[PDB]
Amino acid sequence: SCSKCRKEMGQVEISSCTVDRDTVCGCRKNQYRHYWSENLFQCFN
């Protein structure tokens, strides 16, 4: 499966899933991340 970005974490799609890379998710330029676990992060203003 390709991954989806977590809207409830405020994530946006950066790059789409290709044959050789999963979906890349991130935040907007003025935000920063908090990692709740290795994989799960949230975007804050």
Author numbering: 72 to 116
The article reads:
Here, we present a synthetic route to the TNFR-1 CRD2 protein domain using a one-pot chemical ligation and refolding procedure. As the linear TNFR-1 CRD2 polypeptide contains six cysteine residues, there are 15 possible combinations for disulfide bond formation. The highest refolding yield (33% by HPLC) was achieved by preparing a solution of TNFR-1 CRD2 (0.5 mg/mL) in 6 M Gdn·HCl, 0.1 M sodium phosphate buffer (pH 6.5), 6 mM glutathione disulfide, and 60 mM glutathione, which was then rapidly diluted 5-fold with 0.1 M phosphate buffer (pH 6.5). Subsequently, we conducted racemic protein crystallography to analyze the structure of TNFR-1 CRD2.4 This technique involves crystallizing small proteins from a racemic protein mixture to gain prompt access of high-resolution structural data.15d,17 Here, enantiomeric TNFR-1 CRD2, prepared entirely from d-amino acids (d-TNFR-1 CRD2), was synthesized following the protocol developed above with an overall yield of 16%. The racemic TNFR-1 CRD2 mixture was subjected to sparse matrix crystallization screening, and the best crystal-forming condition was identified to contain 25 mg/mL of protein racemate, 1.5 M sodium chloride, and 10% v/v ethanol. The crystal structure was solved at 1.4 Å resolution, confirming the correct disulfide bond patterns with well-defined electron density. The TNFR-1 CRD2 structure aligned well with that of the entire receptor TNFR-1 in complex with TNF-α,11c showing a backbone root-mean-square deviation (RMSD) of 0.36 Å across the cytokine binding interface. The binding experiments with human TNF-α (Peprotech) showed clear binding to l-TNFR-1 CRD2 (KD ≈ 7 nM), with no binding to the d-counterpart. Consequently, this indicated that the TNFR-1 CRD2 is structurally conserved, and its binding to TNF-α suggested that it can serve as a receptor mimic for further investigations.
Here, we describe the chemical synthesis and folding of a central, cysteine-rich domain of the cell-surface receptor tumor necrosis factor 1 which is integral to binding of the cytokine TNF-α, namely, TNFR-1 CRD2. As this central portion of the receptor contains a significant number of TNF-α interface residues,11b we envisioned that it can be synthesized individually and serve as a truncated mimic for the TNFR-1. Cell-surface receptors, responsible for converting external stimuli to cellular responses, are critical targets for physiological investigations as well as diagnostics and therapeutics design. While recombinant routes for preparing receptors are most frequently used, chemical protein synthesis has unique advantages for research by offering atomistic control and fully breaking the barrier of chirality.
